[PDB]
Copies of this chain bind each other. A is one copy, B any other.
Amino acid sequence: MKVLILEDVIEHQVRLERILDEISKESNIPISYKTTGKVREFEEYIENDEVNQLYFLEIDIHGIEKKGFEVAQLIRHYNPYAIIVFITSRSEFATLTYKYQVSALDFVDKDINDEMFKKRIEQNIFYTKSMLL
């Protein structure tokens, strides 16, 4: 399965990509991820290719909070079958996902511990595989 990540902060990118690898070995699931903090580069991966199934978006991006929400709408448009998952530290945005009419599978707080963080990343990947028939 292919995964796209919107993250402009490296340390969270590596925390996630590291975990995506662990699940790929433990659970034995072929996972290939792409991460960028460049909104334009990320969008090229949406419009120009409808192949990805899972998306990890950070909301607050380059001084523009809710930019992830906007980019999420773009995913839902160019790929209505896309599984959108939010990874952010702005916990107060949890109830704001519905306004942008995205249908997020999950909303993960970055602040939670690594064990449970890896757990909820696992759950979103498992959900993805099952939904891949």
Task: Determine the interface band of chain A, counting residues with CB < 8 A from chain B.
Answer: 10 to 19
Min CB gap A107→B, angstroms? 5
Write out, one digit per residue, whether chain A residues 51-66 have a CB within 8 A of any chain B CB (1) or not (0).
Answer: 0000000000000000
A105 within 8 A of B: yes
Min CB gap A24→B, angstroms? 20
Min CB gap A90→B, angstroms? 13
User: A80-B131, A131-B80 given as contacts; is B103 within 8 A of A98 (CB)?
Assistant: no
User: Could you say which residues of chain B place their CB within 8 Å of the CB of A101?
Assistant: 105-106, 123, 127
A95 within 8 A of B: yes
A94 within 8 A of B: yes
